[PDB]
Amino acid sequence: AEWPRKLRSQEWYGGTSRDVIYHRGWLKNQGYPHDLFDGRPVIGILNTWSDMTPCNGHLRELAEKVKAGVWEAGGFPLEVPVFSASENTFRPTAMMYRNLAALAVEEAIRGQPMDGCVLLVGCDKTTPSLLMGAASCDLPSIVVTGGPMLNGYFRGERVGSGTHLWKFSEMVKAGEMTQAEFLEAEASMSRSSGTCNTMGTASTMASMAEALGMALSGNAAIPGVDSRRKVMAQLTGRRIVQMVKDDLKPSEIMTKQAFENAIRTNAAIGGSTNAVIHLLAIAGRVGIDLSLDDWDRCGRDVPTIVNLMPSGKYLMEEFFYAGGLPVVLKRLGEAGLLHKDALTVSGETVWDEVKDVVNWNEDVILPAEKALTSSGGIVVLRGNLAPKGAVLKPSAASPHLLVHKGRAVVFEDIDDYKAKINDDNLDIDENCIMVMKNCGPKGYPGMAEVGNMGLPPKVLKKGILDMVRISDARMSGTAYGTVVLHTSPEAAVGGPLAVVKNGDMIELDVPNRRLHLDISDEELARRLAEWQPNHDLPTSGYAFLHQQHVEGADTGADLDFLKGCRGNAVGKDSL
Amino acid sequence: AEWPRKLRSQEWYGGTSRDVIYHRGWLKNQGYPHDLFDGRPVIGILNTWSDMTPCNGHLRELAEKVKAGVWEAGGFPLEVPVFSASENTFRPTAMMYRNLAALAVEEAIRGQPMDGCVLLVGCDKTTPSLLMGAASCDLPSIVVTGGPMLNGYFRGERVGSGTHLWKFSEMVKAGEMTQAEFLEAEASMSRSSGTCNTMGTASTMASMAEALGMALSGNAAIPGVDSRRKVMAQLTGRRIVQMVKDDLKPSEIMTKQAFENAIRTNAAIGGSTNAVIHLLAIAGRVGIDLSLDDWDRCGRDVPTIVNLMPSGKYLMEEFFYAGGLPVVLKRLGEAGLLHKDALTVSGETVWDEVKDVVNWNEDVILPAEKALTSSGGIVVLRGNLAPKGAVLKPSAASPHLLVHKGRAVVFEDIDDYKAKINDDNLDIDENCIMVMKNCGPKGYPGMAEVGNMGLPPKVLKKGILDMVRISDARMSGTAYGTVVLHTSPEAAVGGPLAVVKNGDMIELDVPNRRLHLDISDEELARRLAEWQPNHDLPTSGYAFLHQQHVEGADTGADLDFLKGCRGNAVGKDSL
Amino acid sequence: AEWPRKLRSQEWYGGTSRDVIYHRGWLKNQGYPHDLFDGRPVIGILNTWSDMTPCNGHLRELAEKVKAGVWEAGGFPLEVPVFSASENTFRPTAMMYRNLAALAVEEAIRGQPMDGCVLLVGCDKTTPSLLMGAASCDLPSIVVTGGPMLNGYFRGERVGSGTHLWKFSEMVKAGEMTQAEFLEAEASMSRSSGTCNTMGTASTMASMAEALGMALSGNAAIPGVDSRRKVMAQLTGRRIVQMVKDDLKPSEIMTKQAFENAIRTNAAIGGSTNAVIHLLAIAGRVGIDLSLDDWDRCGRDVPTIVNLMPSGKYLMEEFFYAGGLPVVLKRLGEAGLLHKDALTVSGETVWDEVKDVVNWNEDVILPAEKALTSSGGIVVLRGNLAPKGAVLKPSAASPHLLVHKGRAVVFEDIDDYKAKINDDNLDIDENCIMVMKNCGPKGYPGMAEVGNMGLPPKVLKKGILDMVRISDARMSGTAYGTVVLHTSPEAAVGGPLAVVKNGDMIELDVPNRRLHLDISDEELARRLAEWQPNHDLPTSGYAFLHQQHVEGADTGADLDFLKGCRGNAVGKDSL
Ligand code: FES
Ligand code: FES
Ligand code: FES
Ligand SMILES: [Mg+2]
Ligand SMILES: [Mg+2]
Ligand SMILES: [Mg+2]
């Protein structure tokens, strides 16, 4: 596009009408030179900082670095806080507030005199909520990630965010650790400012951001407190001004190719199962046709080569010193698995960004023959038990359980699980299949990370730590096990998983992508004909709104009316 | 000056040596793009903010604005706290520490990789101490003034910072007010963030710096919380980068013409007497030839026209709304009393910055025919009693006492004064002459603002509020009365003032600039013969340093070994 | 100590006089409830933060954490920036300004209404300068250390702060490495906020302050960006308030035993040679008699068990995770080498603080029988060549060189060596004694860190990296080799070292603490008798102050008029 030209902020700040004396005159009450309003690019810095989002606790400092970049680059920077859907404070689950955050972000961008956006995110759900909202305006935008925490440690041994909460609490159930030992691990578990240091949802959506092209190369793995995270922020501030002038919009970056790059990247890094739901959501805002079948297709025969927990051994620091995601993207290109000419916010293709990087540790970023799995992509299972799809993370499942048939042990909701799971009389053993209902988008409500249900203590004491588990919930990106997730449609809407009865037999078969309830079709229609809701039914509030409008996990669990891209047209004026 | 060129900051940050890797490499630990060390101007922003300098309490917010401007102009901003000699916390008196703060500032500038300086100041002694430090280096520098507080308000009346502290405290012991009522005025007295709102030292020094050309036009009177003060700071951050490229140095702005512009401006505004001391010290560092007589000469027949406490009626807000110092300066050029071609930090002559401005309240900036005084300049008296000079602020004195003769009532030090003044048995009437010694630079120590002695209560209860007062002390810029100050040599070093005796007659003659002790030259000669120095001289500490090196107030009371300009040659390196 | 009682801040802020109405009314312009002036402890938070002290980059965040603690404990926190003698910026050498900064710190304490102090330090010379300053007032004070940077890395390997600086630049001279390779490591060398991460001066002075009891247990090794740094700062804020109420003064803490504890801790951790100078300076302000001989006696037979560069293999991170200084202090006590009853700022004895900690890594905090050295204490050599003492750090020297005789190669000043060192025709071998003069306190001036002269490139290429080097300079605490330092008296004040000529025989016998010039008493007699002092002594500014008053390195290189403790009596009032 051509420059100079009238950007949308001049609808507020250019000219001489009483309307612009009002807008420009009132903002000057903070000491701004008059020429800031001359039509140079006005940059919104959307900031999800918050004392109650501790994973992003340093993003105010990151914001100052972005500002200096905009100043240098000739723009007018302005910081705008936005909804921070913090993973560790929000109950019933931060997943419930992702759409709300996206709503507020979209309105905050379109409603106000900003020409381009910088999106400062970190904790799990902040990255997709802000990308969803900016995609619905399609103004030039760029991601700055806060970064992982440093390695935690306990008893001279490496500890990873989340993954060891599962390990320790199971160990405690198995009699291999006391709750007091667990407590002492607390102080050194999260011990710098940043996001979970395993390959959880935070680290995955940072990789997805980088691999879509929405952040400068290297953005994903730089530790939160590392000097170069602040360099990257300043340089992002410089770039965005230039991006506005050129008019490099999100819709030119996140192409079908870009989404396929991010999908094969999730296989390579052992990405979290929530990337499936978020990438779908984000694509539904950009306007790209993207389905569960693209996920399954693209991740097939892509080895998981990044050696981090929960699938592997190390944490985010090692991955960063190994060279980070640009080394994964070079590999994907080297193996012919990359759209090399995808565009990035830098204005270079992904290949031209990464072509010359170096793997500094083949124990962290593995050679293709020593991968954790030769087909690392998440698998989509279908069948009468999950007619709209269900997913599993192969890089952290048990091989002997990937095909398995056992007797169903049913929990009607999460409170049903917590009541029975420790009962020593619970009729369950290691061959059984644990099934849980009503933990989906409408059922939980919010689709909580509870599908990685803990094992019966009496199985754990035989030294068995895995079992086939099925639910319509999610699990943490930090979790592991042979867990079948996102079962669609969810029970709370009369999907077949609502009618599963104890004793029923179920067949899992990953190679044939098959999830089967072994009852006749007559018995199924009969059970389903008697379905009813067995979950909470809100009468008002945002909970009501969510209950009425949230789609299923198989499409991204967006709100139906919030789908797609609504543009950035300035409204009528306010006076 | 050649641009581009290698600036002194490149001695630390330019090239590929082991030494440059150390220096550049370490600063980089804060997140700085490598191109910031490529030779752009590095701008040190010297901040006198401290939680214990309340008058300067908003300087952090101002420093951020200076940084923004620097980034804009393409320099490299680095904030650098420096000693803040707060007038209302430091005891025995901030004056003692003025030189200490100029020493620290001078070394902080030369010892580190600044190419130009920004001087963030406010409270009384911060302005002179930072200007003294920078003059001794002569790197491109520029001033940002903190700004005066809003008006105080007690019982619907205007209350002024300082001036009403003396008015109220004398009314208390006159029997016209109670301390209880004095205390009620407290919280509405100093009720915004900034300096004293009268025409005191901070308002005078702010004007001095503008009048010298060391600060952008309009700097002195903007209220501290007025949004146009932050605008001023941002524009100053832009322009310091350009002065470094151009090499606009302090020696080039503070010429002799500049200093006379300053002296004539001080008479026009009825400025603080401390302006005399501070300005002699500053010219002491630039190396300009400036003397007491220059002061008497230049303020002669310059009418005081700024109707502000303590000479006049209103406060700094009123001054700012009428037009601030630019009006005053223009009137000086219209009157033939301005060096119109003296150059300023802006690159323009002073006349060019002021010649078009508009006086918006002649009740505040008075026309010459209504001037508070016809000869507004501070006067210098000489005579056997002050061989090296004493000063008096006529625009806040009583005309009928400017020629007076009377009986000496003599106080040996400040304890003796406090011990005697309120004694109704003291032989004193309104026609006597109050004399105090041992309050000078070495005597007090530090030359405290105690020269405006309170009158004896019994005189005050006659409705009388002015008597002639002589001492070696200073007085606040906010004080008033017919007060003879800065008497040199001070008693502590054996000046004539030391041998004045109760009952001696003294003659004050201001038109003839005479201050005469009426005793025979043989009698004064022998009285001095028995003079002995003070006891309990400080044997160690800064107090020791000050006792050995401070000069008399007749020259600026700098330290003898700190006079002059030592330049800005980079030192040897530390490895 | 009685509580409640009148603290010294009430001299400014208690009661009803106009003097107090001025002090208290003016600070209230920043918005403080009246009751904050009720006499609760006013805590001065002395901050050495500065954009030009990048090693202390985060101390503003730490200051806020301290304030919060002071609020919680019921005090009135006020932050006061103070001189910041940044090692990586100041030139000629930050050591020149260590006393300047102590001067400022002292006056800012006694001159303002603070009842207690928190010292926020990091970079080498900040820790000692605020400790000297606070020692000369004796108000209750407590230290907060910034903390070290995270490990650096190059080519997947660990790089140490400063230590790898000397290492790499010597490999370039010996042909094993290019300047351009050197430059690549720079971006990953200093990669988080904090101090040098070897066992250098900052690490050592932080350890000395914990060893002294002047800082809370664990204070020393917590990295800058580690979340327990912020906890410690808030815990310190709480504690100082109580210290003021109890009146726990530094003279109560920094006892002879406490200094012994510090000297022995230095040996155990292989600390910097600069601790010898800084500890004596600090003792000179407290009034405790302490000598170079105390040093030699106390470190004898104390093995260095901390296996960090430059002496060992690892960095501060690993030291932190092994258990830090508490584990070291604990071991001294287990070996009978600890004053277990020395009292700390917490009101507990050191042994009571550390007696239960756990060594979490025997490779980093070694067992005695695996120590780097069995007698790790710094050694004090005497002899005709250093009649007043010289020092050497055994834990990082070559043992075959601790008893050696050789021909002297004499550089008369740092410019002399800089011109001679890389000339292949320089007559020198791996058995000569590199001697260099005129780098002492007065000579450099400021006693730069240059005693560890880079070897002759032709020797380095034979694969030799160590030679006996002797001077009156310091070296970096990150330095290694068989280096003799602080040779007293210095050459510039006519000490023997001044007169060595090439070819003189010098003997170094460390086990016998002897350093000998092999010439006749008469020939040395004659040599000195015709010695002239340096020409071009500085005649103004701080350089003159320094030339006139700095004592020798053998007493800590204070200024003579600053030694001792002048207390905290509030001065006369300013009005
Ligand atoms: S809890 Fe915030 S990233 Fe996991
Ligand atoms: S006390 Fe600060 S300007 Fe008067
Ligand atoms: S340069 Fe600051 S600790 Fe080394
Ligand atoms: Mg999550
Ligand atoms: Mg004053
Ligand atoms: Mg050092």
Residue numbers in the entry:
A (entry chain D), B (entry chain A), C (entry chain B): 5 to 579
Kindly provide excerpts from the paper associated with this entry.
To study the detailed effect of C-terminus mutation on the three-dimensional structure, the crystal structure of variant H579L with product analog 2-oxobutyrate was determined. Four polypeptide chains, or a tetramer, were observed in the asymmetric unit. In the H579L variant structure, this helix − loop − helix region was observed in the closed-form conformation. When the His residue is substituted for the Leu residue, the interaction with the Glu453 residue vanishes, and the side chain of Leu is rotated. The rotated Leu side chain also induces the conformational change of a nearby residue, Asp23, from the recognition helix. These subtle changes result in a larger substrate-binding cavity despite the almost interchangeable size of the residues His and Leu. 2-Oxobutyrate was refined inside the substrate-binding cavity in chain D of the H579L variant. The oxygen atom O1 of the carboxylate group at C1 position and the oxygen atom O3 of the carbonyl group at C2 of 2-oxobutyrate were both coordinated to the Mg2+. In addition to the 2-oxobutyrate ligand, the residues Glu91, Asp128, KCX129 (6N-carboxylysine), and Glu453 were coordinated to Mg2+, leading to octahedral coordination geometry. The distance between C3 of 2-oxobutyrate and Fe2 of the [2Fe-2S] cluster was 4.4 Å, which would leave sufficient space for the hydroxyl group of the substrate.
